[PDB]
Structures are given as structure tokens and as C-alpha cells.
Amino acid sequence: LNDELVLHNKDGFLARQEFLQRVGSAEDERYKELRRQQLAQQLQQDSEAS
Amino acid sequence: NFMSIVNCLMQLRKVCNHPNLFEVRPILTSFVLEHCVASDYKDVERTLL
Amino acid sequence: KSLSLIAAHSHITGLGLDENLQPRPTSEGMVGQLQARRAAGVILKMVQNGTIAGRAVLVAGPPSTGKTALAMGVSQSLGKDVPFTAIAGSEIFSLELSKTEALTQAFRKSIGIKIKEETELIEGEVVEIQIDRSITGGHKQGKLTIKTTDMETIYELGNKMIDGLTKEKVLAGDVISIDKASGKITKLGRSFARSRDYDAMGADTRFVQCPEGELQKRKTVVHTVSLHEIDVINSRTQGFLALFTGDTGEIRSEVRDQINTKVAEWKEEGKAEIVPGVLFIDEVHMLDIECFSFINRALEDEFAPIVMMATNRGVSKTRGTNYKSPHGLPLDLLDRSIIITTKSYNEQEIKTILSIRAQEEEVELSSDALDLLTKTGVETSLRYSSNLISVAQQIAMKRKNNTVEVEDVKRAYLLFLDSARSVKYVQENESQYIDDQGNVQISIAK
Amino acid sequence: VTRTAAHTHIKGLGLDESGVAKRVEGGFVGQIEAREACGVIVDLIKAKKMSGRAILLAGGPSTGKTALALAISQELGPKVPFCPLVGSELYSVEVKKTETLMENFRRAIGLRIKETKEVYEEVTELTPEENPLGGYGKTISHVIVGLKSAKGTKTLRLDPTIYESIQREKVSIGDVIYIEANTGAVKRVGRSDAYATEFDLETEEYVPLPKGEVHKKKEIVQDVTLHDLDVANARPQGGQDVISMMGQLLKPKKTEITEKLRQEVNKVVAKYIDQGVAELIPGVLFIDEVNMLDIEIFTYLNKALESNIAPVVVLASNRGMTTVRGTEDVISPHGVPPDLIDRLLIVRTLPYDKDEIRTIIERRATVERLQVESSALDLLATMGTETSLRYALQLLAPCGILAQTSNRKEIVVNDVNEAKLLFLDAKRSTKILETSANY
Amino acid sequence: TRTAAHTHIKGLGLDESGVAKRVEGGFVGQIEAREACGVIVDLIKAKKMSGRAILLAGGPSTGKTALALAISQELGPKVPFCPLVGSELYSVEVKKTETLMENFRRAIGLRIKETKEVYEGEVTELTPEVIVGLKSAKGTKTLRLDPTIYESIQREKVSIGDVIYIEANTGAVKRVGRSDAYATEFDLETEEYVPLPKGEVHKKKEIVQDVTLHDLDVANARPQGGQDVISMMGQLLKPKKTEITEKLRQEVNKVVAKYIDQGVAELIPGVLFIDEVNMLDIEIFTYLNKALESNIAPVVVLASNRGMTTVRGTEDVISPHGVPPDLIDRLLIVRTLPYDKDEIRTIIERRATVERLQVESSALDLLATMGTETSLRYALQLLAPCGILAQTSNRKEIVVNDVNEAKLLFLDAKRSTKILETSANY
Amino acid sequence: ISMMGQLLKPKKTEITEKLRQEVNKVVAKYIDQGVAELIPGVLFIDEVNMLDIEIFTYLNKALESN
Ligand SMILES: Nc1ncnc2c1ncn2[C@@H]1O[C@H](COP(=O)(O)OP(=O)(O)O)[C@@H](O)[C@H]1O
Ligand SMILES: Nc1ncnc2c1ncn2[C@@H]1O[C@H](COP(=O)(O)OP(=O)(O)O)[C@@H](O)[C@H]1O
Ligand SMILES: Nc1ncnc2c1ncn2[C@@H]1O[C@H](COP(=O)(O)OP(=O)(O)O)[C@@H](O)[C@H]1O
Ligand SMILES: [Mg+2]
Ligand SMILES: [Mg+2]
Ligand SMILES: [Mg+2]
């Protein structure tokens, strides 16, 4: 059963999990960047106001 | 980091139940590509006529 | 943008020239071909002028000597906002449209018009919508509150636009744009207001926004549309669908005449401008005598874009006829056009092109490896070396070293054959391949 | 900022009252005999008597045939139709070539019709409506509507049917409408401009109030072609049911329009002409490179020309004694079958000369807004006489570009030499093609 | 099991160094071709180049199609692989170039992630606006629905007490069936019964479904909507495929670029295999020449067994392998060599052992000599009749008598031609 | 389907063999009951010299049907 097993594992099941976790990390990093830039904008506006 | 007992545990899970605990056979349905192009040219068409 | 893997002309970035239309020895991707580069620059300046119509230029020369490269260069240096329709001669023969109709559509696609209009706009942060029911005194008592960076004001809805804001679920606290005359509501996302209130929505809202100026202003909207798009739009009830499905089906001539008259009236009314782009035809020898005859007349029309042609052969038999003609084109069409010739390539030019391709494909080459590649290119062809340079990268990675050496190039040369070597091998053992008459010998013995 | 394309420097035949062609007028130089013949032909077309006459112009490439035909079209005027075509344009895919030829044949003759209409145009008030006294479950006897306009107001009474049409339009009380009593159709022009600022926003354009009397009597004159009537009858646009509109949704493909429909259209047009309502005006059908036509279309042209309402056809060809395409052993002049050239008349176009080429180059330079020197113009004329007339005219523009690059307004000899070296012609390309290994 | 001229080939049989073992992965010989194919496979896996074009040229029965299949199988099911023959490009309703471009778009793939929202459970009330009072085994919730999904509901003849299953992303509606609660209403009730679904009425799932560029191009080129009558009649209005404008392709490219930039999808270029390229004509060759110099084109592999022959569609243009020289110039040629006696014997042994057959040594040697004398494919195909002839005699092992009788019963090409020439009546 | 047929000008289509087989089976069943009778006819073709070789080859197979 070696060859079909090797082929299907080349497709793999955990590969889909790794792809999903990569997408999750990507959108989490995007959200973190948005949060950081919004906080920086708020801080600069507050410093300008005072 | 480290993982050595989870291998045996989830191997036991796969031997015990088999086709579950991660995914089932899903209800197949088409992809829902949604940006479309009609609304892009709707304004141009309305201006033209 | 325009996510792509690679192109054979990816390194070319808009020709290369000076303010005096003089070609540098090496700039913006392409090297050599000084006279052809200057001719292409003159053609580009003529196109940018826009005061001359229906000029035909034919780029001719031996294969693999900067013809499509030159076309890509002039197209890139021309930039956006000016149409450039590149087509091949073999894609005009279709079962749905006659070749004349396809040629007409290609000609119309290469000329655009910019329609300019002036519209008032209302922008700002909306803070509250109030909506009432149907009452004898008023059909609908609705009010809108808008906050800019400097102004807060109250608007009253007039029994229709409430359907506009209730057609899609909109909500306050965001910057929106609404047109007085058009009545369309464009929600641009979410306002700034307080950072915390929109800092936990899980991205979305297109990186929010903040109000910029006043409530209402006057702006100018410019729409760029090709003529062929206008004929398709006016041909049927819903032709903009045909702009994607491609089932126009030989639009009638009355529509084209009406479009021409209306576009001219717009042009001398000051409501629209004309951009005469470029139409490029690769492998023009694949066309037909009927297509050439039609082009002879289509070139002289007022709305005729600048036409560029690329051919390889010299003194061949034109398709649809039985006589041999130069360049695969009839004599009258050649008389109607202006010819730009290209020469062969020097060893130094070949080496420079190979180095450019190397730095384009993020591959490091040793000096002796580059010399060997240049020698092979001079011996056989440029494209063979331009492919070997990329194929040797994987062999280099197989040895766990990034740099490419002489051994990798030698292995690639000995692994992947060439036209001359393949021809010699075929002629040496012609009894194994399928003959012209179909006779083959398969048995090893006897 | 005006565009030019191998033409627009010609604007007529340059003929005086007596039909004598001046040497240099209307953008033309030389070709006196051809210009006189074309003027005679356009006079015959203006005579509006003949039907089916056929003219063919013969001459070498770059001799003025297309210019002559465009001059004829310019002389005729915008009202009379002028349908240009190329020989290869007849080979359609949707329908047979004979049908396309007949359609373009009918597209050449035109018809000017007139019709007098009354119309009514701010709505002031409207009242709908007696006792049934029969089988009328719900009765609306009449509807009273008042309009304001600008030059005085007026009220009137109108049928329930136009009231239901108004309800279909769903107009308000403070609106401006457009009601045509000929067809009993109401069109909502829009709101009233003076009724603005009732609400802070309103999508609908308010539109000003109509000018003049509300009850307008007027007449309209429209020019169409018989092909327009044929298309309208073949593919009617009316219909409200599903089938009609879904047929309108499909792409409109040309069919084989029957002869009976054309006969009925002709009968109706003749009946309307006899009343003086409309008048017909024959046009011109122009064909380029008739050698691209095969034997079938050439044969069908014999039957089409001998019809009753055939227009004047003008044909162009530059071939000599060649085989008519579609057959392999028929040598004919200009690639036109002997019967067809027996059916038509021939106008010959003569080749130019050195002085004529020089004057043409000068005229093109003047119409292109360029400055040239006498020595440079002489060199350009010699170059044209050495290679071709079209070569100098095409090469004029890059010379102007090169002059503009060096901040010089005048075309000079070195610019012309540089353009010659930069851009080749057919002869040099042919001479350097065969003298090489790779093509 | 079932075998058909293949499935004994399981890969290129290469090691980590790329050196091809003499016998590995159902392959013998063809070392240089296997190494070149492995290099091309690595280049494809790099996912950097675009439009690379190689062809493998050799005589018949040399393993070109086998090499292409081995490349496809070694690449893996993740990477799309489009096989084709030269004769498929001559369609009826669309031009040849459009079909070639359709295959080009079909060649490359795109893996994307999407979230699907689902509702299901028993229906408590149905009031026109539509308001649906869904109730699961643990939760209850009321939903507002569009007129189109209401029409789909009506066409499903749903009623109170029917467990249903709605999908929010696409609007698809499916009535699962009558709830188990009303299981006693008719002694011979035809309707089936289903227990109430478990969990809350609203669920969300994340899927990693793959697609191809041609799939989402034809998605908005022509629809396949579903349960709505209007969509059904719209998709029925046009039954024929048509040529796609380049504007749709550009919009598709822009949308896909935005998707991959947003970190939601990834692009996996594929391979386009064309066997017997000699069937192509000059126009298709020219258009392929033009289309190879693009920025999205995949890797194309071509197969041909021809000498110096005339290109189809031309009169006197002769070229090697029947391919125009201009397209040859931008090609990478891989040679393929004929076999020897021992290689033929080993291949015959492999094909015998995959077909669960027993062949004795003398019979194997006779088969190898026959294959050398006539052809390799003939010797390979004569195995099954020999097996059946052995079985009829109630045996298991192929014997010399069996191969002799198979020779008597069936003829090869040479003897057939010999009997054709020496006969009176055709 | 009726609207589609009315709106499409239903030109002839190559009828599948399955429909012909179903018709043959039901007709055989009915003639088994004595309510129907079969009557072979005559197909007359003049000027057969105008037939193509493909039509002749297909006729070779068609004449051998039952
Ligand atoms: N002047 C140049 N600069 C850079 N690359 C060039 C130049 N001329 C040719 N090339 C290379 O040649 C290839 C294109 O060859 P091309 O001239 O289009 O062949 P053909 O004329 O037969 O169409 C491109 O990959 C390009 O990299
Ligand atoms: N007598 C003339 N006066 C002015 N221009 C002329 C004259 N004869 C020819 N030309 C010019 O020559 C150009 C090409 O001639 P054309 O009529 O296209 O030749 P052909 O008859 O072969 O089509 C035209 O743009 C036209 O302006
Ligand atoms: N190295 C090999 N090992 C095993 N079988 C092979 C080998 N090379 C070729 N074959 C067999 O030869 C037959 C012909 O191969 P294929 O590539 O399909 O056609 P061709 O070689 O004529 O192009 C195939 O059935 C294949 O199984
Ligand atoms: Mg090229
Ligand atoms: Mg002409
Ligand atoms: Mg094969």
C-alpha cells in the first residue's frame, strides 16, 4: 500500500491544517497592525490636542 | 516546543473512532466568489444611456 | 500589482531613451538596437501627439531579435490611460464573427474616450438617522444628521431615499458619500470618532476612516471607455454583459455611424476627449488577403489608431493566394506602411542580455559560467541560453549551493538537447521516427 | 488639435458652373478628365431619375480613386445617403452573402417623411371619476387635468385609458408631464423646479418648467432608409408578454428577409409618396477592391442592378488582367466578369507626375501645419518620384517630430535624410530581404 | 483490480541526489530522460517561472506518455495537471485558439479558504412578509428571508414540522424531511422521518476548497445558479459555450491578486500535457507561440514521434517532429532512446507480475525474443491471451505451447502486411 | 420547456438510439396484444450517383438491421 499512501500524504491532511493556521496568523497580524496604527493615530491626535 | 504523548493519544483516537474528531464528509456546495463585475460597469452604462 | 509569475519580457520597463529621443546603450531593460529604439521612440511621440491618424508601421527582422520586446517596450513607455490592444493574427478566424467584424472590433478597442462630468457630493460622518411612519401631514418624517471635521447639520428625507438607506443595512457612526442628483449611497466603511469603539470589530471596514473636510463639494468624474464598448452598450438591451460573455454578433453599421456622429458632437461640444491608442498585431503573416484588403480601407478612417505589425518571414506565399510576396504581405499594404528593420545580435549584447535575465530570475552566475552561456548563445541561439540559465538553477540547488558554476551549465547542456543536435540525431536514425510517408521500423533485430 | 487621416485636404471636385475642372481647387490637382466625369455622375445622381447605373474607376495604386469617391460623397451632401463598403465585407457568417449584399443595396436609398403632432405640457390638479347603471363594476367616466406651462394655464378632460396610463407612470400632482394626444401616451418629464427645497434631499432631477403655450402644434421631419423599415418590420420591438421581451434579450442575428416584406414596404411607401407626405431620395453604394468579390456575388449583381429601385453603385479596382476569384480559368480585366463590365461604365485614372507630386506634398504639409524648405521639398519630391507618392506623405510626420525635438520649426534636408535612414520603404526592404540567411 | 497499459509506473524513481536508479518505480532504463524530467519537476515545484516549454521526442514505444504520467504522479494530486491530445482543439462552437486558452486557464489552480454559515432544524411557523421560526434540538431562532429563498422554500413544498437545512452563503435550500415527533399520523405514511438536528440553529464552518482559474472565470462567464426558476430559465436561455473576452480574464486576475494579497488564498501553477502535437496546424502553433510569452502561462509539455515532416496546414514547410522552427527555438528538447533485449525482458516480467500471472523462464525468453523480432507492445499485449489459453487447459503457468498457440491465433503488423500484399481480393 | 421550444426555432436534432429502442420495445409489446400490426414499406432513391462514399458506407451497415 506504499504508493497510494505516499501520494495521498503528499496531498496530506495536516497540510490543510497548516494552510488554515497560516491564514489565521496572517489575518491576526493584519488585525494587530490595524490596532497598532489606530492606537498611534489616537495618541498623536491626543498629544496634538493638548 | 514539545510533543510526544499526543502522538500516541491521537493515534489511539484514529484507531478507535476513525473518520471523525477532525472532519466529517461535508455537504458540498459551490464557491461564492462575490465581488462580481456588473456593479463596476452599471454606472458607466447608466451614464451612457 | 497585477500578480504574475514571470514573463519573457518581464525585465523590460518602457523602452529606453533620453529627452532628445536618443537611445542609451543600456537602460530600462533593453540593450542595443539603437536605430530601432529611436524609431520606436519617434512612433511613441507621434502617438502621444494624437494629431495624426491611421499610420501603419511594420517591424520586420530575423526571429529572436527584439521585435515583441520592442513592442512591449513602447507599450510600457506609453503608460496607462492610453489604450494598447495587442492581438495575434491567428485569433481573427472565428466561427461566430466574420474576420472583417473581428478586425473592426480590434480597431475600435484601441481608441478610447474620456467623458468628463461635474457632480456635487455630500460626505461626512453620519451620527443618527430618524425614521417615522406614514401620516396624513407627512408621508414620511425622516431626518439625517451629518458630522464633518468642522460642521454638524440636519437633512430631511423626501419619501424616496429612505428606501435607499433601507435597501441595505446601513448604520450611523461612519463616513458615507451621497450624490444629490444620482441618489446613490456609498458607505466607505467606519468613521474614526473614538478609536476603541471600532478597534474590536475584527479588521473590516477597510481600515476605517476619518472625516476630512466639509459637507458638500463639487467634484469632477472622468470615465474612460473604448468606442467598441459604446457600440456593444448601445447594440442590445444589456450589452455590458456581452462585454464579458463575448457574444456581440456583428453589430450593425447604423449603430457605429450614430456613435461616430454623437462622439464628434461631444468633442466639439467640449464634453469628451479622444485618446487615440495603439493596436499591435503579432505574426501578421498569419492573416488573410481579405483581411489585408479590409485593412487597406480601414486605415484611412478618421478614428483609426496607430497600427504596429510584427512579421518574421521574407518573400513567402501570402495566405489565401498563390503567389510569393515579401514579408507575407501584399504590395499595396506594404506601400501603405513604413518599415522598421532589426539586425542580429553581438556577442557582447548577448552577454548583457543574459546577465539581465540572470538578475531578473534571481540567479547568481560565475564569470566563467556567463562566458560559457554567452558562447553557447552565439553558437546556437539566445533563447536556448535564456532557458538553460533557468534550468541550471535546480541542478545547482541539488548540490546544496546557490551559486551556478561551469559544471551545472555543462550538465544542463548535456541533459537538454537543441534544435541542431536533435536534427542531426534524427537524420542519423531516421528509421526509428515516423517518416513523412508514414513508414516506421520498430523491431530492433534485423 | 484636429486629427487627419490620409484625407480631409479634399473637400470637393473643384468644378466651376460649366463643369470645367480647375487645375488646383478643392484640394485636387490634375486628374481633370476623371474629375469632370465624376461631376457629370454626381449631376446625374442629383437628377433623381435613373436607377441602377454603375460606374467603375480603373487605375494603379495611389492614383486617386478613393479620393474621387470621397469627393463625390462630399459634393453630394449630408442628406443623400452614401454607403461605403470593402469587397471582403460581404462575406458574413450569420447570413448568406447575397442577403448582406441586398441589405447594403437597400441601405443606400433613403426616405424623408414628415408628420404633424399636437402635444400638451406644470401639472396643477387632477380629478378622476358616474353611476354604473349596467355591467360596470367600477366606473371612471372621465378625468379632469389642469396644466400650467409658461404662457398661461389651461384645464381639460380626458379618457380613463390615459388616466390608467398616468397611474402606470405614477406621477404626482406638482409635476411636469409630456402627453401626446396622437398615441394617448403620457411621459413624466419630472418634478417642477420651482417646487424644490421641499426636502433637504431628493434623488429625482427637478427640471425647469416647459416654455411657451401648453397646447403645442408642431411638425417633425425625419430621414430614414428603406433598410430601417425592413429591420423594424422584421424584428418588431413591441410586446409586453414574456416571449417578446425574452426574444428581445437574445442577440439580434441577421436573417434572410423575405421578398414579400420588401414588396409590402414598397407599396406602403408608394402610397405615402402619392399623398405628398414623404419623398424618396436615392443614394450611392460604394465598393472598394471589387476583385475581392467572387463569381457568385458578381452574378447576383447583374440581377440586383436590373431591379426597379436600385441605387447608383460606384466600384473601385486596381488589378489588370487577372483571374476572377472563385474560378480558375477566367482572365478578365480588373478582375470583373465580362458581363458586369458590359453592364457598367469605365472611368480611367492617370498616374501623376513630378510637379503634381510636389504640389501634393506641399498641400499635405500645409494641411498638417508644418514648415518646410524649398530645397527640402524638392528632395522630398525627388524621393517620392524615386520610391512612391505615399512614401513621402507618410514620412512627412516623423520629419516634423525630429524637427520639433531639436527646437527647430522648419523641415530641413538633414532631417529628411535622417528620416530616410531611420525608416525604410518597400523597395529597400525587398532588396535586403533576400540577401540574408534567416528570413 | 483493473489494469490498462499503465499503473505499473509509480514515479520517476529518483533519489535525493537526482540520479536515476536503473530499476525503480516501475521504470527500467531511460536514465537521462528521467533525470531531465526530475529537473523539470523541481522547476515546476519552484513556482517561480512561467511559460516554460519542453517537449520529449522519440520513436514509438519509448515511454513518452509514460514519462508524462510519471511526472504528473510525482507532482501530486495538489498540483493541477491537464492532459490533452492535439485533436481536441478542433471544437465546433468555439475557435481553436479559444479552446487552447481555456485549457491554459484550466491548467493552473488556486487554493482558497472560506467561511460557510448554516441554519437547520424544525420549522415552527411560516408567515409571509418571509419569517421562519427555526427550532433545533437545543435552540430556537427566527429569521427573515428574501423573496427568492422564499420561492425556493415554496417549490420545496415545506410545511410545519419539516426539518430543513438552509445555507446562508449560497441561498441553497434543502428539506431534510418530516420531524420524528409526528411519527404517528398515518399507518402507511409514505413520508420519511428524521430526528431534530443537534446543536444550535446557527453554525459556522471553515473550508479550504480548491478551485481553478477557469472555474471562477466560467463562474461569471455563464452561471449554473440553482433552485430559482428565474435563474433556471436564464441559464436555459443560452445553451452553448462562447469565447471569453480578455476583459473578463483581466478582472478575474485582479480579483485573484486581491485575494492572495489579503492572505486568504495561494496560487499553485500546474502542467499542461499535449500528446501528439503533430496534429496541430500552423495557426494553432502560431497562437501558442504568442501565448507562451505571457505572465500567467503554465508549464507545457509536448509529445511527438515524427522525423523531418511537413507541418500540417502548410504545403512545403518541413521541420523536425513536425513543429515550426520558431516554436522549436523557445523549446527544450528531451531525447528518448530505444530499448534492448534485457530491458524488454524486464518490462515483460514487470507487466506479467502486475497482472498476477506466472510465466516460466523459457516462455519469458521466447516472449523477449518475439518482442525484439516484432515489437514491444505486441509482446506486452499477447500476455493476456496466453493467460486465458493456459487457464482453459486448467493450468496457472504460461508454457511455450501457450505462446506458440497465441502466435498462431493472433498476428502482428508485419505478418498482416505480408498477407495483405500477397493476396488477390482486397 | 414549452417556452424554450417556442423561443428557439427547434431545428432537427440527432435522435438518440435509446429513444428508438424504447419505441421499438413498446411497439413490440402492443403488437403482441393484437391491437397493432407492422407494415414494412419501400424506400425509393433515384440518382444514387450523387451519394457520397460515407453515405454508402453507412448504408452498408444500415441494410443489415432487423
Ligand atoms: N534588446 C533586447 N533587450 C532585452 N531582451 C531582448 C532584446 N531583444 C530580444 N530580447 C529577448 O528576446 C526575447 C524575445 O524575442 P523576440 O524578438 O520577441 O522574437 P521574435 O522577434 O521572433 O518575436 C525576449 O525574451 C527578450 O528577453
Ligand atoms: N489629384 C489629387 N490631388 C490631391 N491629392 C491626391 C490626388 N490624387 C491622389 N491624391 C492623394 O493620394 C492619396 C492616396 O491615393 P488613393 O486615392 O488612396 O489611391 P487609390 O486610388 O489606389 O486608393 C490620397 O490620400 C489622396 O489625398
Ligand atoms: N522504462 C519503462 N518501463 C516500463 N515500461 C515502459 C518503459 N518505457 C515504456 N514502457 C511501456 O511502453 C509503452 C509505450 O509507452 P507510451 O509512452 O505510452 O507510448 P510511446 O512510448 O510510444 O510514446 C507503455 O505502455 C509503457 O508501459
Ligand atoms: Mg514575437
Ligand atoms: Mg483605394
Ligand atoms: Mg506513446
DSSP result, D249-264: HS--------HHHHHH
| Torsion sign over Cα E377, E378, E380, E381 | positive
Cβ–Cβ contacts within 10 Å for residue C178, how many? Answer: 24
Distance, CA of E131 to CA of E142 (rounded, Å)? 7
Q: Is B9 helix (H, G, I), strand (E, B) or coil?
A: helix
| Torsion sign over Cα E22, E26, E31, E34 | negative
Q: Is D281 helix (H, G, I), strand (E, B) or coil?
A: strand
Asked, colleague to colleague, whether C116-221 and C347-426 share their fold, the answer is no
CB distance C405 to E282 below 8 Å: no
Those residues whose C-beta lies under 8 Å from the C-beta of residue D138, and which sit 6 or more positions away, are none
Cell 510576396 found at: C325
For ligand 1, mutation pick of C67, C74, C361 (most atoms within 8 Å of CB): C67
Residue type, F63: L
Those residues whose C-beta lies under 8 Å from the C-beta of residue A33, and which sit 6 or more positions away, are none
What backbone torsions phi and psi does residue C241 show, to the nearest 5 degrees? -65, -40
C65 annotated as belonging to a binding site for a ligand: yes
Buried b (16+ CB within 10 A) or exposed e, D256-285: ebeeeebeebeeebeeeeeeeebebebbbb
CB distance D257 to D234 below 8 Å: yes
H or E element that contains D286: strand D284-288
CB-side exposure of E160: number of CA atoms within 13 Å? Answer: 6
Closest of C310, C118, C307, C302 to residue C227, by C-alpha? C302
Q: Kindly write down the DSSP assignment for every residue of D358-400, as one continuous string.
A: HHHHHHHHHHTT-EE-HHHHHHHHHHHHHS-HHHHHHHHHHHH
Distance, CA of E208 to CA of A20 (rounded, Å)? 7
Cell 442592378 found at: D305
Q: Is A32 helix (H, G, I), strand (E, B) or coil?
A: helix
Adjacent-strand bridge partners of E165: E120, E174
Using alpha carbons only, give the angle C8, C10, C16 rounded to the nearest 5 degrees: 115
Distance, CA of E151 to CA of C427 (rounded, Å)? 71
Cβ–Cβ contacts within 10 Å for residue E181, how many? Answer: 12
Those residues whose C-beta lies under 8 Å from the C-beta of residue E378, and which sit 6 or more positions away, are E370, E371, E412, E413
CB distance A23 to E263 below 8 Å: yes
Q: Is C124 exposed, middle or buried (0-12, 13-18, 19+ CB in 10 A)?
A: buried
Q: Is C444 exposed, middle or buried (0-12, 13-18, 19+ CB in 10 A)?
A: middle
User: Starting from the edge strand earliest in sequence, which strands make up the sheet with E265-268, in order?
Assistant: E210-212, E109-112, E265-268
C-alpha distances out from residue D370 to C50, C114, D7, D366, D377, Å: 15, 28, 16, 6, 12
D391: Cβ below 6 Å to ligand 2?
no
Helix axes D295-305, D97-106, angle to 10 degrees: 40
Cell 523459457 found at: E362
Q: Kindly write down the DSSP assignment for every residue of E342-395, as one continuous string.
A: HHHHHHHHHHHHHTT-EE-HHHHHHHHHHHHHT-HHHHHHTHHHHHHHHHHTT-
The span from the first CA to the last CA of chain E, in angstroms, equals: 41
Using alpha carbons only, give the angle C169, E147, E225 rounded to the nearest 5 degrees: 100
CB-side exposure of C400: number of CA atoms within 13 Å? Answer: 2
CB distance B35 to E259 below 8 Å: no
Contact B37 C244 (CB under 8 A): yes
CB distance C347 to C376 below 8 Å: no
Those residues whose C-beta lies under 8 Å from the C-beta of residue D188, and which sit 6 or more positions away, are D169, D171, D175, D176, D177, D178
Cell 541539488 found at: C398
Distance, CA of C75 to CA of C59 (rounded, Å)? 14
Closest listed ligand to the CA of E65: 3
Distance, CA of D419 to CA of C340 (rounded, Å)? 11
CB-side exposure of E304: number of CA atoms within 13 Å? Answer: 26
Q: Is E159 helix (H, G, I), strand (E, B) or coil?
A: coil
CB distance C398 to E17 below 8 Å: yes
C-alpha distances out from residue E43 to C216, C388, D329, E46, E369, Å: 57, 12, 59, 5, 40
| Cell representation of residue F49 | 450517383
Q: Is D219 helix (H, G, I), strand (E, B) or coil?
A: strand
CB distance C360 to C389 below 8 Å: no
Give distance in angstroms: CA of E354 to centre of ligand 3.
15
Cell 501530486 found at: E76
H or E element that contains D317: strand D312-317
Closest Cα in chain F, distance from residue D243 (Å)? 7
C-alpha distances out from residue C50 to C255, D119, E333, Å: 25, 47, 47
Q: Is E218 helix (H, G, I), strand (E, B) or coil?
A: helix
| Cell representation of residue E148 | 427568492
Q: Which one of E220, E245, E260 would you mutate to disrupt binding with B, by most B Cβ within 10 Å of its Cβ? A: E220
Q: Is E255 helix (H, G, I), strand (E, B) or coil?
A: helix
CB distance E269 to E262 below 8 Å: no
| Cell representation of residue E223 | 452561471
Closest of D311, D322, D300, D383 to residue D101, by C-alpha? D300
CB-side exposure of E369: number of CA atoms within 13 Å? Answer: 10
Residue type, D97: K
Adjacent-strand bridge partners of E140: E135
Buried b (16+ CB within 10 A) or exposed e, C68-85: bbbbbbbbbbbeeebbbb
| Cell representation of residue A32 | 494587530
E strands, E149-255, where?
A: 162-167, 173-179, 193-194, 202-207, 210-212
Which is it for strands C338-341 and C56-60: parallel, antiparallel or unpaired? parallel
What does the CA dihedral E150, E156, E161, E166 come to, rounded to 10 degrees? -60
The span from the first CA to the last CA of chain A, in angstroms, equals: 73
H or E element that contains D323: strand D321-323
| Torsion sign over Cα D431, D432, D437, D438 | negative
In the DSSP assignment, the letter for residue C314 is S
Distance, CA of E367 to CA of E404 (rounded, Å)? 10
CB-side exposure of E126: number of CA atoms within 13 Å? Answer: 14
Which is it for strands E299-304 and E53-57: parallel, antiparallel or unpaired? parallel
Q: What ligand 2 atom has the least distance to the C-alpha of C332?
A: 22
Distance, CA of D111 to CA of D322 (rounded, Å)? 40
Adjacent-strand bridge partners of D97: none
Q: How far is CA C285 from the centre of its chain?
A: 22
Distance, CA of E310 to CA of E373 (rounded, Å)? 30
Q: Is D437 exposed, middle or buried (0-12, 13-18, 19+ CB in 10 A)?
A: exposed
Distance, CA of E166 to CA of E196 (rounded, Å)? 14
What backbone torsions phi and psi does residue F42 show, to the nearest 5 degrees? -130, 135
F3 to chain E: which residues are within 8 Å by CB? 233
For ligand 2, mutation pick of D4, D7, D10, D289 (most atoms within 8 Å of CB): D10
> With an 8 Å Cβ cutoff, is E92 touching chain F?
no
Residue type, D267: K
What backbone torsions phi and psi does residue D17 show, to the nearest 5 degrees? -65, -40
Adjacent-strand bridge partners of C113: C225, C274
In the DSSP assignment, the letter for residue E168 is T
Closest of D321, D435, D391, D348 to residue D65, by C-alpha? D348
Distance, CA of C83 to CA of C110 (rounded, Å)? 5
Closest of C74, C17, C69, C29 to residue C357, by C-alpha? C29
What backbone torsions phi and psi does residue C109 show, to the nearest 5 degrees? -65, -25
Using alpha carbons only, give the angle C317, C320, C322 rounded to the nearest 5 degrees: 45
In the DSSP assignment, the letter for residue E243 is P
Q: How far is CA F45 from the centre of its chain?
A: 16
In the DSSP assignment, the letter for residue E195 is P
Q: Is D224 helix (H, G, I), strand (E, B) or coil?
A: strand
Distance, CA of B5 to CA of C333 (rounded, Å)? 80
Those residues whose C-beta lies under 8 Å from the C-beta of residue C125, and which sit 6 or more positions away, are C146, C147, C148, C173, C174, C175, C191, C193, C211
Cell 501634393 found at: D360
Shortest-distance Cα residue to atom 6 of ligand 3: E63
Distance, CA of C313 to CA of E317 (rounded, Å)? 12
What does the CA dihedral E92, E94, E100, E101 come to, rounded to 10 degrees? -160
Using alpha carbons only, give the angle E118, E122, E125 rounded to the nearest 5 degrees: 110
Is the CATH number 3.30.70.360 carried by domain C116-221?
no
Is the CATH number 3.40.50.720 carried by domain C347-426?
no
Q: Which one of A7, A18, A31, A32 would you mutate to disrupt binding with E, by most E Cβ within 10 Å of its Cβ? A: A7
Shortest-distance Cα residue to atom 10 of ligand 3: E63
C-alpha distances out from residue E111 to A12, A28, B49, E256, E272, Å: 14, 20, 40, 11, 18
Q: Kindly write down the DSSP assignment for every residue of C134-161, as one continuous string.
A: --SS-S---EEEEE-SS-EEEEE--SSH
What backbone torsions phi and psi does residue D309 show, to the nearest 5 degrees? -125, 30
Distance, CA of D56 to CA of D361 (rounded, Å)? 27
CB distance E383 to E390 below 8 Å: no
Cβ–Cβ contacts within 10 Å for residue E230, how many? Answer: 10
A11, A19, A20 ranked by CB distance to E76: nearest: A11
What backbone torsions phi and psi does residue C433 show, to the nearest 5 degrees? -80, 170
Q: Write down the experimental method used for this entry.
A: cryo-EM
E strands, E145-264, where?
A: 162-167, 173-179, 193-194, 202-207, 210-212
Backbone torsion region of residue D41, taken as left when φ is above 0, otherwise alpha when ψ lies between -120 and 50, otherwise beta: alpha
What backbone torsions phi and psi does residue D66 show, to the nearest 5 degrees? -65, -40
| Cell representation of residue D185 | 401616451
For ligand 3, mutation pick of E65, E72, E340, E353 (most atoms within 8 Å of CB): E65
Give me Rg for the CA atoms of chain B: 25
Residue type, E363: A
H or E element that contains E183: none
Q: Is D411 helix (H, G, I), strand (E, B) or coil?
A: strand
How many residues does this entry show for chain A?
50
CB distance D292 to C290 below 8 Å: yes
**Helical segments of C81-138, H only:** 99-109
Closest listed ligand to the CA of E350: 3
Using alpha carbons only, give the angle D225, D229, D231 rounded to the nearest 5 degrees: 110
What backbone torsions phi and psi does residue C81 show, to the nearest 5 degrees? 65, 0
Max Cα–Cα distance, chain F, nearest Å: 44
Q: Which residue of A has its CA nearest to C200?
A: A35
Q: Which chains reach chain F with 3 or more Cβ–Cβ distances below 8 angstroms? A: D, E
In the DSSP assignment, the letter for residue E244 is P
